Amino acid sequence: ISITTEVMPVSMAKTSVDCNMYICGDSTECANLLLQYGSFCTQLNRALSGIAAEQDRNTREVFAQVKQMYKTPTLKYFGGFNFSQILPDPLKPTKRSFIEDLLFNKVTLAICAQKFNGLTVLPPLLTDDMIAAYTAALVSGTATAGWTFGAGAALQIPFAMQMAYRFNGIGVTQNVLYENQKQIANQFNKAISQIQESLTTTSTALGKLQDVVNQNAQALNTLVKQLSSNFGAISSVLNDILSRLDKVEAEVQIDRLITGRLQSLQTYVTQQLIRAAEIRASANLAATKMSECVLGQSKRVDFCGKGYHLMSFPQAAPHGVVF
Amino acid sequence: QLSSNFGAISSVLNDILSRLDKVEAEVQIDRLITGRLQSLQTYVTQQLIRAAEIRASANLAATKMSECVLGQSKRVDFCGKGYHLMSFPQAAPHGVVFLHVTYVPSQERNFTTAPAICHEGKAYFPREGVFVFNGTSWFITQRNFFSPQIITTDNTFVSGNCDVVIGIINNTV
Amino acid sequence: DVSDFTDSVRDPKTSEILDISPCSFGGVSVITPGTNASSEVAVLYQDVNCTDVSTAIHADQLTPAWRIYSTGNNVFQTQAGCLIGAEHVDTSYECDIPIGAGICASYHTSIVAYTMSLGADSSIAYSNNTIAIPTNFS
Amino acid sequence: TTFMLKYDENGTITDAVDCSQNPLAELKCSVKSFEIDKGIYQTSNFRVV
Ligand SMILES: *[C@@H]1O[C@H](CO)[C@@H](O)[C@H](O)[C@H]1NC(C)=O
Ligand SMILES: *[C@@H]1O[C@H](CO)[C@@H](O)[C@H](O)[C@H]1NC(C)=O
Numbered sequence: 001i002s003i004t005t006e007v008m009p010v011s012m013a014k015t016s017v018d019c020n021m022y023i024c025g026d027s028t029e030c031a032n033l034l035l036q037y038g039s040f041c042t043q044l045n046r047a048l049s050g051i052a053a054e055q056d057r058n059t060r061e062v063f064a065q066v067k068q069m070y071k072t073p074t075l076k077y078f079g080g081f082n083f084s085q086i087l088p089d090p091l092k093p094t095k096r097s098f099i100e101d102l103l104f105n106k107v108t109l110a111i112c113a114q115k116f117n118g119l120t121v122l123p124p125l126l127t128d129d130m131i132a133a134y135t136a137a138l139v140s141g142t143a144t145a146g147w148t149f150g151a152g153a154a155l156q157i158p159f160a161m162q163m164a165y166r167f168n169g170i171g172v173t174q175n176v177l178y179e180n181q182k183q184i185a186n187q188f189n190k191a192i193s194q195i196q197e198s199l200t201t202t203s204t205a206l207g208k209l210q211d212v213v214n215q216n217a218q219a220l221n222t223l224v225k226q227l228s229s230n231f232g233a234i235s236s237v238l239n240d241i242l243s244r245l246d247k248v249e250a251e252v253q254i255d256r257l258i259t260g261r262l263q264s265l266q267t268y269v270t271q272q273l274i275r276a277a278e279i280r281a282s283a284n285l286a287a288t289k290m291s292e293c294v295l296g297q298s299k300r301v302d303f304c305g306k307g308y309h310l311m312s313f314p315q316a317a318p319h320g321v322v323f
Numbered sequence: 324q325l326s327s328n329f330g331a332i333s334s335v336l337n338d339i340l341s342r343l344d345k346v347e348a349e350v351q352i353d354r355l356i357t358g359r360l361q362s363l364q365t366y367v368t369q370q371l372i373r374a375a376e377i378r379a380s381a382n383l384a385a386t387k388m389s390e391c392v393l394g395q396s397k398r399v400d401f402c403g404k405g406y407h408l409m410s411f412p413q414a415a416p417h418g419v420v421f422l423h424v425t426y427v428p429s430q431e432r433n434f435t436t437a438p439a440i441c442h443e444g445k446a447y448f449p450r451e452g453v454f455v456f457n458g459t460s461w462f463i464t465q466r467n468f469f470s471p472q473i474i475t476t477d478n479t480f481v482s483g484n485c486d487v488v489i490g491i492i493n494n495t496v
Numbered sequence: 497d498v499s500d501f502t503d504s505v506r507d508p509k510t511s512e513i514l515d516i517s518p519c520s521f522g523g524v525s526v527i528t529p530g531t532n533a534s535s536e537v538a539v540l541y542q543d544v545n546c547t548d549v550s551t552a553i554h555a556d557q558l559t560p561a562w563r564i565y566s567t568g569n570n571v572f573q574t575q576a577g578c579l580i581g582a583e584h585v586d587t588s589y590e591c592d593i594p595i596g597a598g599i600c601a602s603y604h605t606s607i608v609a610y611t612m613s614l615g616a617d618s619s620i621a622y623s624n625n626t627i628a629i630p631t632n633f634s
Numbered sequence: 635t636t637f638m639l640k641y642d643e644n645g646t647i648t649d650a651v652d653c654s655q656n657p658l659a660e661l662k663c664s665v666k667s668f669e670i671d672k673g674i675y676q677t678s679n680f681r682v683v
């Protein structure tokens with residue numbers, strides 16, 4: 001018996017920009033010159049809000065698939081299989097599981113305070129507690145509550161007859177499980193332990209979730225860095241060229257900075273649209289794996305596992321899921 | 324964006340050419356040409372991104388019509404929400420609509436089961452079902468519908484001896 | 497700071513050092529029941545402190561200054577900004593309109609803000625010798 | 635102030651909306667309508683002068 005891990009991003013950070021505070025600071029004349037360009041601030045705001053709403057749709061599609069929140073059994077020992085370290089621990093303060101705690105520590109980032117940029121980051125609709133609650137109902141409904149799940153309702157199988165029913169689905173007979181239950185149960189427990197050890201004392205196994213964070217940070221750093229450069233004007237800073245430049249020779253130096261800053265903003269929004277489409281194609285795949293591998297037994301080759309698929313368990317992660 | 328000036332005297336041509344005739348008009352027209360060229364390029368790029376998102380949906384619809392409509396899918400929740408049975412396509416404006424027909428068990432009942440049976444020092448396992456105690460006898464039935472069938476040598480098969488199993492129940496066959 | 501802005505300054509009056517924050521800006525979004533069932537609306541000031549933006553409305557220091565507007569002591573903190581015009585409740589529902597981190601607003605019976613209801617609380621009787629088998633279909 | 639004037643097919647102004655009286659009035663002048671579906675819509679920004 002083997003257990004392998006698979007990491008998939010499903011979401012990314014939600015950003016928004018203040019089109020007038022970024023292009024211009026606290027200057028009235030800069031705002032007036034901006035209105036000549038028509039509806040460019042409104043287009044950018046709508047484009048970024050469209051992406052932001054989509055991130056919440058991605059998460060709801062993957063995780064909110066069970067209409068009922070089954071309670072954790074409080075036994076966590078079914079037949080011979082040790083299901084702890086997957087389900088939450090009642091006496092622990094956190095609502096997560098042991099393995100989920102390992103995942104949340106590993107993926108590290110790159111009360112209210114603002115920045116002079118005009119940029120900000122909105123919070124996701126589903127908190128980490130809600131996401132962690134969902135994956136507990138899926139695991140607890142898989143061990144107990146029978147395979148009949150999704151297409152129907154829970155049907156209360158003893159979990160010694162699942163593996164017999166799932167061994168029967170790969171081409172072996174039922175007597176293979178029953179006569180070797182102790183060996184099969186032991187190999188299951190050892191496989192989970194090695195997953196624990198590898199997660200605790202590794203360096204880089206969640207690079208897909210790491211790449212999402214690093215790419216987002218690089219994009220925002222570039223946008224800020226463009227504020228500190230003129231585009232053929234006397235200087236980048238306003239009120240230092242806007243004072244000793246009469247009142248008509250400064251109207252053409254400002255139009256140079258404004259045109260340059262719009263392009264830096266437009267370039268940023270266009271690349272967020274291409275990046276979001278990549279996350280959407282990844283969140284769609286993770287939703288199909290949650291339905292065909294967790295809620296069923298998959299016969300497609302190399303889709304869920306590597307050998308012959310028996311079953312699967314979902315665990316939450318920062319802006320992603322782990323199977 | 325056509326009714327929008329871009330720093331020029333006027334946002335409409337024939338009103339810069341009427342009040343100017345030479346390089347003075349060229350300097351204003353260049354401001355308009357630059358502004359109108361950007362808004363046109365921005366429109367085209369956003370259409371390219373949208374066109375790709377709708378090609379991915381048209382590819383999924385082509386996979387559904389091949390798998391759900393021309394056959395019977397074994398994939399979970401791919402076609403409907405229960406046990407897929409059939410499917411029909413219906414045209415819609417700039418789209419398609421599918422009518423999935425699925426099977427949904429409803430009632431449910433409680434029974435007592437077992438993994439095997441011991442008759443003559445040998446273990447009998449089921450082939451394509453489970454053992455249900457019912458309350459008066461011992462039967463073998465299919466997992467999706469309730470239909471007790473009397474046990475027989477054609478329902479079960481002999482595997483191993485009557486030692487290594489957790490919970491055999493002695494019964495006739 | 498790391499963004500090469502002005503994070504601090506030293507007073508030239510022979511005194512100590514201070515800090516500098518960017519005053520308080522953000523966005524506003526208006527929640528509406530649909531104009532077919534009511535005319536009252538709630539307002540969300542995104543990413544602010546309710547105390548800071550409640551006194552600002554008192555001294556008339558907001559650039560979007562609405563002539564006929566007031567705050568009827570319904571200020572709510574949430575985490576996605578300051579909410580004004582909707583009263584907090586402790587009865588979870590199905591999130592008609594989403595707001596911030598696990599907060600939603602609905603009309604029901606004035607606008608009311610609550611916490612999301614994930615699903616129905618259910619339990620399964622797990623035993624080691626019992627099976628359930630359907631007897632009817634649809 | 636900014637107004638949102640409605641023109642009739644006969645060519646005469648019929649109704650209007652004052653885009654600075656209410657938060658709702660600002661919403662109307664932003665989506666260019668007189669009736670709006672339920673939801674949350676983002677409008678202009680705010681500063682503390
Ligand atoms: C199950 O695994 C946990 C994790 O180490 C362990 O503490 C517990 O003792 C195990 N259960 C049994 C019955 O050995
Ligand atoms: C708001 O400010 C008060 C004191 O000024 C502070 O105690 C509180 O934590 C702040 N709330 C925030 C920043 O969300």
Ligand SMILES: *[C@@H]1O[C@H](CO)[C@@H](O)[C@H](O)[C@H]1NC(C)=O
Nearest residue numbers: 430431432433620621626628
């Ligand atoms: C089967 O027994 C369980 C445990 O008491 C109970 O919850 C369930 O309702 C029973 N099923 C039926 C159909 O009565």
Ligand SMILES: *[C@@H]1O[C@H](CO)[C@@H](O)[C@H](O)[C@H]1NC(C)=O
Nearest residue numbers: 079160438489490491624625
């Ligand atoms: C189910 O639990 C009872 C209670 O100890 C036990 O006697 C019985 O052998 C168990 N059945 C199986 C299949 O383990």
Ligand SMILES: *[C@@H]1O[C@H](CO)[C@@H](O)[C@H](O)[C@H]1NC(C)=O
Nearest residue numbers: 429430469630631632633634
């Ligand atoms: C199944 O349900 C239908 C409708 O509820 C009913 O007419 C039919 O008699 C039921 N069948 C059985 C075997 O109870």
Ligand SMILES: *[C@@H]1O[C@H](CO)[C@@H](O)[C@H](O)[C@H]1NC(C)=O
Nearest residue numbers: 641642643644645646647648
């Ligand atoms: C427009 O004018 C026609 C006749 O001039 C009149 O019948 C109608 O009521 C007016 N208003 C409309 C059509 O809304």
